[PDB]
């Protein structure tokens, strides 16, 4: 029983255009309740889901200088970082970090994050203790002396222990029956002829949340590891996801194959079969 | 908040 | 985030102090700050806290869990400890309104 | 030793007279701040900077930013209640969700008069 709240942010910076781009996001679970956009009027953190909108002026007013002192941070770092990896002014480049907490069934903080990546390499990120830093290269071990002699581990472990966890729970009660409630997917299986010595077996998983769920094909008991295909647990487009699963099998054997489903919102796992 |  | 504290206070020099601040439309994001001031001279941090208690070389901040009082300890204190105490709370971090305070005085 | 300098350190200047009081701090912080300090003893912030960047908020007070190390306050049309001592302060950063601890200068203690 785990919940998480996370905070995404992508720096982009583009040169002969001249302005970076700044896109941050925050998510409780796998649930997007912010954004916010520097290619805009004039830049404000907006909700994305109903359950952030009846905060007030204030909430609103505080997440969006949070947002632009980040930005500001983010502006620095791309030059700094032009700087640490020797490059021309010339070349776009990338910036990403990602922070957050997980709360677990115990109440406690569960694990604490604070990683970067540059050029889609990873650059510098927390330990699990909570005390340390993992620096990828020579550049990035630069930043780890700086922030072990500024001791800004534990300045950030007191937010994650701190406003982070309280904001978590604040943010699940008023969106209880949203980020509480698990949606169980609607399964079946259908069936497609290849020839007529084959067939193809899908089982489908629709409209479940939360995102993680596990879908596989069994031959009498067993599970196949070869010769089946899964696409990647996709957005619907509405709060929930879907998936499916699908193996080839022998003409009139296909009695011979199940489909399990584990999910949390199930109340125990799912097997099911073919329906003619 | 940190810099890199 | 406005707060509210005794306007002064009286300690005998080796005692401990402790001075108790009240904070009760504390929000989500707000820590708990206390600056000393003397007179002429720019305002010191002390200690900050979101929860619980914390603890380093200068002095010691206890919160209850509802979190909307906090109290501030002073240890053994000298005569160079008489200053005026203030109590924050919140402001995004970086604004800082600094009310009247608390004004000790340490007697020999 | 390393800390917020600030000069001057008494300043009596005539009305409508324009004035500047220079604020530097050698420690490597971004956040640097300017708080009036009237005779009710107050603390109220002015100005917030952030890597030369304004923050927070007349135009007779001009902060200028040439560096991240200097904010500079220059005040032009001196009048009565700009009488105070003026500190100046600075931060490792701003916060974006942990805080950090304010460091302040000796003050600017400021009389103008008629």
């Known amino acids: 029983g785990s919940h998480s709240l996370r905070y995404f942010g992508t720096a982009v910076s583009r040169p002969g255009r001249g302005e970076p781009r700044f896109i941050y996001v925050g998510y409780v679970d796998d649930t997007q309740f912010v954004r916010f956009d520097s290619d805009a009027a004039s830049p404000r953190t907006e909700p994305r889901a109903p359950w952030v909108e009846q905060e007030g002026p204030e909430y609103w007013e505080e997440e969006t200088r949070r947002a632009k002192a980040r930005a500001q941070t983010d502006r620095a770092d791309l030059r700094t970082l032009r700087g640490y990896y020797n490059q021309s002014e010339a070349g776009s480049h990338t910036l990403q970090w990602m922070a957050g907490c997980d709360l677990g069934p115990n109440g406690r903080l569960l694990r604490g994050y604070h990683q970067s990546a540059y050029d889609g390499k990873d650059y510098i990120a927390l330990n699990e203790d909570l005390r340390s830093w993992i620096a990828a290269d020579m550049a990035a071990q630069n930043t780890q002396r700086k922030w072990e002699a500024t001791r800004y581990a534990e300045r950030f472990r007191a937010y994650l222990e701190g406003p982070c966890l309280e904001w978590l729970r604040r943010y699940l009660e008023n969106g209880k029956e949203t980020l509480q409630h698990a949606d169980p997917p609607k399964t079946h299986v259908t069936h497609h002829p290849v020839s007529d010595h084959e067939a193809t077996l899908r089982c489908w998983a629709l409209g479940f949340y939360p995102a993680e769920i596990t879908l596989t094909w069994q031959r009498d008991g067993e599970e196949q590891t070869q010769d089946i295909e899964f696409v990647e647990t996709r957005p619907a487009g509405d709060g929930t996801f879907q998936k499916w699963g699908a193996v080839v099998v022998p003409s009139g054997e296909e009695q011979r194959y199940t489909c399990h489903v584990q999910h949390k919102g199930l109340p125990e796992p799912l097997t099911l079969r073919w329906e003619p | 908040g940190g810099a890199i | 985030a406005k707060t509210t504290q005794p306007i002064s206070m009286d300690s005998y020099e080796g005692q401990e102090v402790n001075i108790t601040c009240n904070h009760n439309?504390?929000?989500?994001?707000?820590?708990i700050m206390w600056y000393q001031q003397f007179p002429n001279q720019g305002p010191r941090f002390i200690i900050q806290?979101?929860?619980a208690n914390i603890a380093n070389e200068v002095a010691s901040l206890f919160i209850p869990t509802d979190r909307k009082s906090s109290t501030l300890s002073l240890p053994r204190v000298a005569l160079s400890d008489t200053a005026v105490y203030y109590c924050?709370?919140?402001?995004?971090?970086?604004?800082?309104?600094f009310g009247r305070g608390t004004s000790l005085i340490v007697h020999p | 030793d390393t800390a917020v300098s600030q000069t001057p350190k008494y300043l009596v200047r005539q009305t409508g007279k324009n004035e500047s009081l220079k604020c530097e701090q050698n420690?490597?912080?971004?956040?640097m701040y300017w708080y009036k300090q009237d005779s009710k003893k107050l603390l109220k912030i002015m100005f917030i900077?952030?890597?030369?960047?304004?923050?927070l908020n007349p135009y007779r007070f001009s902060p200028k930013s040439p560096d991240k190390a200097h904010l500079n306050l220059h005040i032009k049309s001196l009048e009565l209640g700009d009488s105070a001592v003026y500190f100046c302060?600075?931060?490792?950063?701003?916060?974006?969700?942990?805080?950090?601890?304010?460091?302040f200068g000796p003050g600017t203690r400021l009389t103008v008069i008629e």
């Open positions: 302060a600075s931060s490792q950063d701003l916060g974006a969700g942990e805080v950090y601890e304010q460091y």
């Open positions: 420690l490597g912080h971004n956040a």
């Open positions: 439309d504390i929000a989500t994001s707000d820590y």
């Open positions: 924050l709370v919140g402001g995004g971090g970086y604004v800082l309104t």
């Open positions: 806290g979101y929860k």
């Open positions: 900077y952030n890597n030369k960047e304004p923050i």
